[PDB]
Amino acid sequence: SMEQVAMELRLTELTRLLRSVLDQLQDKDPARIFAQPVSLKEVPDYLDHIKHPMDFATMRKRLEAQGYKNLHEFEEDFDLIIDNCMKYNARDTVFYRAAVRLRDQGGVVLRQARREVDSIG
Template sequence: MQCTMLRKVGYLVTKEIVAQQREAILAKVRQMSKSRIVYEGLPQFQDGKGEGLVIDPKDVPGLRESGWMPNMNVPASPSTKNFERSAMESILSDLQAHPQAWAFKEPVNAQEVPDYYDVIQNPMDFPTMEHKLETGQYQNLDVFIADAQLVFDNAKVYNPEDTIYHKGAVKMERLLMDHVSRVRKIS
């Protein structure tokens, strides 16, 4: 039994066709590449005593031919999304996904809870933390953790211990501390 999709294609010889294409590509790469050229090493390093020696990159044989340019000597800028930033994003995402997070997903509504802002001088919630994270306002993990802790401290200060808000804050605080201890072990 045979199935033909394109009559031009010899399906029985595809292996040979692919091998020919591969060889053609490799031949073109070999033609353009100068990787087979081996340059003499610098004499300063021949005896193994060149440690700490500063040399001009222009003096390195073959460096220019490889495509090097002086502007490539500038050190790469550090990644804007470093380990701490990734950790903060992960922690906040996990906190927001927790079943107890519903109470912290929006700022407290002053019309629904009129005295809240009289009692709580420094309010904090997950959307505010998310905004601060997105706009680069957290200089480090400790500042981020302080804001997360503030969310739960505020809930515990304002609400009596037997309320769902206080109990939820305690559970969320434990989750935060678990994440923080894991991150600190890694870093």
């Protein structure tokens, strides 16, 4: 149908905007602490602690398969990155501190992304 195509064009455009959001958020992690999944070879007990692991590479695979239907789903995944880190790592660690800084800096980006998603529809 023509409606299915119109819907697919909107998804494609949301995908374009989320890719730009993803790039901007990932720049706020210049240490690349959150770039890849936590290694289960190197942290064998990780899944005993964290039930839903997340990282920027995993978000990028989902993104490129157009697997985010809306900004809320994308934010859920970004929040998992931060929140998992802040539970697994103590307050005095470079990892925890990196998550706090990512959260604080990403807030600004996400605030305008919401306005754009609503605005462009």
